[PDB]
Write a protein that binds this ligand. Structure first.
Ligand code: AR6
Ligand code: AR6
Ligand code: MN
Ligand code: MN
Ligand code: MN
Ligand code: MN
Ligand code: MN
Ligand code: MN
Lengths: 154, 154
């Protein structure tokens, strides 16, 4: 039995006994490689006061399934379309939120269109090095993309 | 300028203009391999209504730095100590929360002590297969541990 303290736009805050719980829409993220570069994005994120290295990601909207949301986000954030394959999912922080992320691979990317989101094509090796030297922060989606590449796409 | 709607035990809920922001303590997570098995844990997580596959993880407490928190969580959750090396960090979901996770590798594990947390030693290959067949869910920390192993520890 949850008690609702706040019903919002992209989250609700509930109490369930002693537990503080944030309900949040599910998300998608897209891993894409082209000529050895991974498709990252950056945007100011007010929650953290900086722009971490992410991969294209967004919330699933009403009526959409994860594959469709992934296609949409890739197009809206980067202007690209590709052949998408479902990889895996994860709960971002299941000690307090139900947000679940569905991760896809995109291949055979094509431009389907030519601004608050910066497109950052970068070799994953370089993303990991910049992070190890303190020069960029990762989101979970950016780190998952870099680790997935090193595991399976070299 | 944040406006606070809720100040809690492990989170605060704020508004910053149009943005809904969850402040949350930073976390640590520990990747550990022994005889080809990774050290996972599972526990009921009320936010998601199930027990996802995680790696040992916890919140940093007052006075602690990430390395110390990692040592503590490994001992409290699994009874083990090891030689810990910092790997990388990530923001769990920077579109709404500032929660940051610092991830460590543990080697040369030793038992330093002999219950709501289940210790699940499992080959990472098997964790990934069970997930692909729908049999277990991942937290971000569990997925990061599996991908890191496949990238760097085989
Ligand atoms: N939602 C909650 N609200 C209230 N208190 C809680 C909650 N969850 C647990 N506690 C209490 O707080 C203590 C927290 O136990 P520790 O081991 O340091 O942290 P962790 O494993 O939960 O979280 C580690 C990360 O893993 C996951 O991704 C999380 O989302 C974090 O990102 C518990 O013993 C409870 O008393
Ligand atoms: N904190 C917020 N509160 C209010 N509205 C917001 C917030 N953040 C953005 N919006 C609005 O909501 C729209 C969201 O844009 P989309 O691309 O679908 O999602 P994403 O990229 O933000 O989140 C995707 C994941 O990546 C990160 O890990 C996140 O935490 C998620 O887990 C924005 O255009 C804003 O209008
Ligand atoms: Mn987005
Ligand atoms: Mn978007
Ligand atoms: Mn742009
Ligand atoms: Mn824990
Ligand atoms: Mn603990
Ligand atoms: Mn136990």
């Amino acid at each position: 039995e949850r008690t609702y303290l706040y019903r919002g736009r992209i989250l609700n805050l509930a109490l369930e006994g002693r537990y503080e719980i944030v309900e949040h829409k599910p998300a998608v993220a897209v891993i894409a490689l082209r000529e050895g570069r991974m498709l990252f994005v950056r945007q100011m994120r007010p929650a953290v006061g900086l722009a971490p290295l992410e991969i294209p990601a967004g919330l699933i909207e009403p009526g959409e399934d994860p594959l469709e949301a992934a296609r949409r986000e890739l197009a809206e954030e980067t202007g690209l379309s590709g052949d998408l394959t479902y990889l895996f999912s994860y709960f971002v922080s299941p000690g307090f939120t139900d947000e679940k992320t569905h991760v896809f691979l995109a291949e055979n990317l094509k431009e389907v269109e030519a601004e608050a989101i910066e497109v950052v094509w970068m070799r994953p090796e370089e993303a990991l090095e910049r992070h190890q030297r303190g020069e960029v922060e990762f989101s979970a989606t950016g780190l998952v993309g870099v680790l997935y590449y090193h595991a399976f796409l070299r």
